[PDB]
């Protein structure tokens, strides 16, 4: 298992514009286009992102290109983040993937707010951090996925995904 496979499982693949769980225009593998209610805004955003006249649809290759870009952006964001970098450096490989997953989903900024969970991951207090993470909107809105990421943190294995 690896991050890509991991996220592929959590986000799915869709070649046509679609709305996320929060109602936002998205495409490919979890690629948020816009928070705006307009499909046009979304459509515009999309074309700008592919570099072509898409019409709300993309190819698989296009979806993967975007995905590669996003994961890379995420790793770089964490490494660049004063609050995230240390947590990250402090972790093992599997758990690192779990932090990347959250960041991909909620942004550096949203993850950075899990001040408490973070301190706990840093101290290697697995069960405690798991419970703390569970006390969140995140958990309450996307429980299954949340649970998958959380187990990953608690155990350090890919069991949740197998
Ligand atoms: Cl809560
Ligand atoms: Cl879910």
Curated annotation (Swiss-Prot):
The name this protein goes by in its record: Endolysin
Outcome of substituting residue 117 to F: 10-fold decrease in enzymatic activity
EC number: 3.2.1.17
Catalytic activity as recorded in UniProt: Hydrolysis of (1->4)-beta-linkages between N-acetylmuramic acid and N-acetyl-D-glucosamine residues in a peptidoglycan and between N-acetyl-D-glucosamine residues in chitodextrins
Residues that coordinate or bind substrate: 32, 104, 117, 132
Record's function text: Endolysin with lysozyme activity that degrades host peptidoglycans and participates with the holin and spanin proteins in the sequential events which lead to the programmed host cell lysis releasing the mature viral particles. Once the holin has permeabilized the host cell membrane, the endolysin can reach the periplasm and break down the peptidoglycan layer.
Upper taxonomic lineage: Viruses, Duplodnaviria, Heunggongvirae, Uroviricota, Caudoviricetes
Enzyme active site: 11, 20
pH dependence: Optimum pH is 7.3.
Domain of life: Viruses
Keywords annotated in UniProt: Antimicrobial, Bacteriolytic enzyme, Cytolysis, Glycosidase, Host cell lysis by virus, Host cytoplasm, Hydrolase, Viral release from host cell
GO cellular component: host cell cytoplasm
Gene Ontology MF term list: lysozyme activity
UniProt family annotation: Belongs to the glycosyl hydrolase 24 family.
Expression induction or repression: Expressed late in the viral replication.
Pfam families linked: Phage_lysozyme (PF00959)
EC category name: hydrolase
Single GO BP term: defense response to bacterium
Native source species: Enterobacteria phage T4
InterPro entries: Endolysin_T4_type, Glyco_hydro_24, Lysozyme-like_dom_sf, Lysozyme_dom_sf, Phage_lysozyme-like, T4-type_lysozyme
Keyword Hydrolase carried by entry: yes
Localization per Swiss-Prot or TrEMBL: Host cytoplasm
């Amino acid at each position: 298992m690896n991050i890509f496979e991991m996220l592929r499982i959590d986000e799915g693949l869709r070649l046509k514009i679609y709305k996320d769980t929060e109602g936002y225009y998205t495409i490919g593998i979890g690629h948020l286009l816009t928070k705006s209610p307009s499909l046009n805004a979304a459509k515009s955003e999309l074309d700008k992102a592919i570099g072509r006249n898409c019409n709300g649809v993309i190819t698989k290759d296009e979806a993967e290109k975007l995905f590669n870009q996003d994961v890379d952006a995420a790793v770089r964001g964490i490494l660049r983040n004063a609050k995230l970098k240390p947590v990250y450096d402090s972790l093992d490989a599997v758990r690192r993937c779990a932090l990347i997953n959250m960041v991909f989903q909620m942004g550096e900024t949203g993850v950075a707010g899990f001040t408490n969970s973070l301190r706990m991951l840093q101290q290697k207090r697995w069960d405690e951090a798991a419970e703390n993470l569970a006390k969140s909107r995140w958990y309450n809105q996307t429980p299954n996925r949340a649970k998958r990421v959380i187990t990953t943190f608690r155990t350090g294995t890919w069991d949740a995904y197998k």
